[PDB]
From a paper:
Recognition of viral RNAs by RLRs leads to the activation of mitochondrial antiviral signaling protein (MAVS; also known as IPS1, VISA and CARDIF). Activated MAVS triggers rapid production of type I interferons and proinflammatory cytokines. The N-terminal CARD domain of MAVS is necessary and sufficient for forming active MAVS aggregates.
At the inter-strand interface, the positive and negative charges are alternately distributed at two opposite ends of each CARD subunit, indicating that the inter-strand interaction is mainly electrostatic. The positively charged residues R37 in the 3rd helix (H3), R64 and R65 in the loop between the 4th and 5th helices (H4 and H5) from the CARD in a lower layer (purple in Figure 2B) are in close proximity to the negatively charged residues D23 in the loop between the 1st and 2nd helices (H1b and H2) and E26 in the 2nd helix (H2) of another CARD molecule (cyan in Figure 2B) in the upper layer. To test the energetic contributions of these charged residues to the stability of the filament and the in vivo MAVS signaling activity, we mutated them individually to an alanine residue or residues with reversed charges. Compared with the wild-type MAVS, which potently induced IFNβ in a dose-dependent manner, point mutations at multiple locations of the inter-strand interface abolished MAVS activity. The gel-filtration profiles (E26R as an example in Figure 2—figure supplement 1A) and the EM images of the negatively stained proteins verified that these mutations impaired the filament formation of the MAVS CARD.
Numbering used by the authors: -1 to 94
């Protein structure tokens, strides 16, 4: 019963507006996402190498969604990676 209404709403927003998020660079954002496990990190770096940014970004969001507090992890990480506008939009949806 983990996932909250706000989390789901946020995930669905990112899904519907995925092209808004295309300038995330997966490799740069990964170490900031403290909600990911070391195993998650390992797998996502290896996924990136094989499939590239665009497909790995899809996998990143579904990977995030399985973890505690991913929304706030993502918001923090977006700010840390010079994407504060994306952070603001995500926070706005979460609190809506």
């Amino acid at each position: 019963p983990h996932m909250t209404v706000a989390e789901d709403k946020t995930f669905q927003y990112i899904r519907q507006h995925h092209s808004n998020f295309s300038r995330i660079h997966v490799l740069r954002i990964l170490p900031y996402l403290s909600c990911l496990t070391t195993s998650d990190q390992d797998r996502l770096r290896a996924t990136y190498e094989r499939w590239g940014n665009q497909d790995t970004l899809l996998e990143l969001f579904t990977s995030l969604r399985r973890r505690n507090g991913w929304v706030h992890s993502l918001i923090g990480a977006l700010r840390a990676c010079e994407l504060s506008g994306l952070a603001d939009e995500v926070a706005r949806i979460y609190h809506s």
